[PDB]
Amino acid sequence: GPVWRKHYITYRINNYTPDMNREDVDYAIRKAFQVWSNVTPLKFSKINTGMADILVVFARGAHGDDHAFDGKGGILAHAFGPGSGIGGDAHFDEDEFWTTHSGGTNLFLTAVHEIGHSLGLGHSSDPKAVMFPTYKYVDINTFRLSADDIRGIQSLYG
Ligand SMILES: [Ca+2]
Ligand SMILES: [Ca+2]
Numbered sequence: 001g002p003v004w005r006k007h008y009i010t011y012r013i014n015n016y017t018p019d020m021n022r023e024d025v026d027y028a029i030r031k032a033f034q035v036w037s038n039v040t041p042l043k044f045s046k047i048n049t050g051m052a053d054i055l056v057v058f059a060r061g062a063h064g065d066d067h068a069f070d071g072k073g074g075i076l077a078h079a080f081g082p083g084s085g086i087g088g089d090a091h092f093d094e095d096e097f098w099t100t101h102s103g104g105t106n107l108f109l110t111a112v113h114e115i116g117h118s119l120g121l122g123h124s125s126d127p128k129a130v131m132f133p134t135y136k137y138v139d140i141n142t143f144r145l146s147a148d149d150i151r152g153i154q155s156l157y158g
């Protein structure tokens with residue numbers, strides 16, 4: 001599958017969910033990128049204008065792609081694999097209630113999963129992997145990638 005062929009990757013937060021404080025959205029997304037830069041040669045930088053590699057969007061229902069959202073529950077977010085244009089972009093369903101903690105749906109944990117897709121990972125069959133396809137809260141302050149996630153990403157980078 002596709003991978004980024006450069007080490008400096010940019011992201012941009014297109015818009016902000018009203019569910020959270022702005023600074024908390026920024027921090028959750030930054031921390032999620034750091035999870036992956038920790039285990040690859042990739043470097044991620046936030047930009048505020050122009051075209052980023054990875055555009056982060058909060059949207060509800062139909063929102064201009066083939067992965068229409070479905071209201072509260074069900075699909076929480078989705079992301080495109082590496083490539084030009086919409087490639088890399090990560091979309092979060094605004095019909096969820098995003099949080100910094102164990103209430104609602106944790107943005108950081110969901111972003112770690114989606115960014116995994118943005119970098120070219122697929123799903124894992126291992127329930128302990130962040131790339132497992134059902135959300136579960138785990139303490140975000142002590143979060144660590146599973147061995148399965150590390151093997152997955154290091155098959156693509158580094
Ligand atoms: Ca893109
Ligand atoms: Ca949904």
Ligand SMILES: [Ca+2]
Nearest residue numbers: 019094096097
């Ligand atoms: Ca919401």
Ligand SMILES: [Zn+2]
Nearest residue numbers: 063065067091
């Ligand atoms: Zn979308």
Ligand SMILES: [Zn+2]
Nearest residue numbers: 113117123133
């Ligand atoms: Zn997924």
